[PDB]
Structure 1
Amino acid sequence: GGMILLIDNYDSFTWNLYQYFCELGADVLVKRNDALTLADIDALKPQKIVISPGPCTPDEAGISLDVIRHYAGRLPILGVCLGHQAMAQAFGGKVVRAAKVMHGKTSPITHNGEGVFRGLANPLTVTRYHSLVVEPDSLPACFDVTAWSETREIMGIRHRQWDLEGVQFHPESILSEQGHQLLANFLHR
């Protein structure tokens, strides 16, 4: 089938991600990161996986890291905020304090028109709820940086071989520009 599995990491906004994907006509199953095993995912046979934001570290995000390790190269995966950092960590990346902590602030980001930014305007204004970024110096070679903040912080990554992509912002915030088309790129791609 075309079922999308959204792994809920206990974010304030995870049902906004669910509703945006329903607006695009997706069949979405939502499971908390500790209510699901790898064996369960195998039985469900999702076409794709989304790893949601959440207020914990990648290590504390239940099966989130295990899903990246087991399904990278097997199913398309999208990481949002925590999901994006988990993606970075799983391949050898490091996460560090951002310049300024950003809680419901909009910033312009510049992208390369690749991955989820295919066909989207540049620059793009997006909503941020995070205090950590993926450290640019230690970013595994397998990732391209797909988007930068005005202060040169990583806002997006794409795996060079596999359908495996992270965004550091909330595309589903009502003031995140082209949030629907960005997620449509992941859905229909």
Structure 2
Amino acid sequence: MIVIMDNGGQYVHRIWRTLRYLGVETKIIPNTTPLEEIKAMNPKGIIFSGGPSLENTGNCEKVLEHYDEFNVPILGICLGHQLIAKFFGGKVGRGEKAEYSLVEIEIIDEDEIFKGLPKRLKVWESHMDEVKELPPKFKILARSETCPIEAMKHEELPIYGVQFHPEVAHTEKGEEILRNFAKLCGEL
């Protein structure tokens, strides 16, 4: 079971449908779902979805505060990436290109979610906002010309962020990145 916390973005269903296509048990829940209830689902992984506003992240930060009750892989997508960054002591701010487009990224550490993938990928993303200061204890996994932090992970915990939307088909290997993340939740 991969739980997708709905932060209100336009592409949240695509995350769910991608996982379904992959044969992964998954459910979208309101981001305001109480933690106990999230715990009663026995999640093997959690996704913090995109959305319009850091002011509407519901209990995403609460999940991180209580990570010891979960101890499963977490993937933040765009706003989810940014909220993880803020929570862990990094900084988010405006980028230089607010419109969505395909952007080429360079994978600098294939780690887990980029395992087996090419070194450069075009991904569907905006930089209306982005991570400006990496959190302590995190490492960068991918970059682009205008944004050094296109993907990141905690150095010690399976907590991941991507700035772009792997759930959008335009993203090269987007389905594979989601698959790689799901495979992490099935092994430990």
TM-score, normalised relative to structure 1: 0.91
**Which of 120, 123, 129 in structure 2 is aligned with 1:123?**
120
Q: Does 1:37 align with 2:37?
A: no
Answer yes or no: is the 8 Å Cα contact 1:129–1:170 preserved in 2: no
**Which of 78, 85, 88 in structure 1 is aligned with 2:85?**
88
Matched with 1:188 is 183
Answer yes or no: is the 8 Å Cα contact 1:115–1:158 preserved in 2: no
Letter in 1 for 2:115: R
Answer yes or no: is the 8 Å Cα contact 2:76–2:161 preserved in 1: yes
Matched with 1:110 is 106
**Structure 1 position 141, deviation (Å):** 2.5
- Tell me, what secondary structure is at the counterpart of 1:154? coil
Unmatched tracts of structure 1, length 5 or more: none
Q: Segments of 4+ in structure 1 off by > 6 A? A: none
Unmatched tracts of structure 2, length 5 or more: none
The aligned length equals: 182
TM-score, normalised relative to structure 2: 0.92
- Tell me, what secondary structure is at the counterpart of 2:98? strand
**Structure 1 position 130, deviation (Å):** 4.2
1:32-181 map, 5 Å:
32-34=30-32, 36-57=33-54, 59-71=55-67, 74-103=71-100, 105-112=101-108, 113-135=110-132, 138-181=133-176
- Tell me, what secondary structure is at the counterpart of 2:140? strand
**More strand per residue:** 1
Answer yes or no: is the 8 Å Cα contact 2:97–2:127 preserved in 1: no
